[PDB]
Amino acid sequence: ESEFRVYSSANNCTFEYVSQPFLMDLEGKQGNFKNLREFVFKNIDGYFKIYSKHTPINLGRDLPQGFSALEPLVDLPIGINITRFQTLLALHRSYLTP
C-alpha cells in the first residue's frame, strides 16, 4: 500500500507504536457478512482507550440481538483530547490498466 493516500506531511512526531494486527478474524477478501468487529474509542483522564470484540456474527439485516462485552485492547497515556474523528476504508486497484 501507499501511506500518502491518507496524509502528505508528518511534523513533530513524538509517539509511534507497532503491535499485533488487532483486526482478528480476518478471512478472504469477500468473507463479509460472516463476522462483526466492534470497537469502542474513549479518552478519559488522558488515557485513550481502545476496546474491541471480533465476534464472528452471522449477521442478519443489522446488528443482531444479544450481548457481547468489549474486552479492553489498549490503554495509552497520550493525554490529548479528541473532538473530530474519521473512519478509514480501503480500495483495490484495477491491476490491469494504468
Partner 1 sequence: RPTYGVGHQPYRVVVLSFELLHAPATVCGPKKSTNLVKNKCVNFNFNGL
- Can you spell out the DSSP letters for 26-82? --STT-TTS-EEEEEEEEETTEEEEEEEEE-----SSS-SS----EEEEEE------
One character per residue 37-76, x = contact with partner 1 (rule: CB under 8 A): --------xxx---------------------------x-
79 lies in the site for partner 1, by CB under 8 A = yes
- Distance in Å, CB of 76 to partner 1, minimum: 9
Q: Which stretch binds partner 1 (CB under 8 A): 2-10, 16-24, 27-35, 77-85?
A: 77-85
Site for partner 1 in 1-40 (CB under 8 A): none
Contact between 25 and 35 (Cβ < 8 Å): yes
Distance between CA atoms of residues 41 and 19, nearest Å: 17
Question: Which amino acid makes up residue 5?
Answer: R
Residue 23 CB, shortest distance to partner 1, in Å, is 25
Footprint of partner 1 (CB under 8 A): 45-47, 75, 77-79
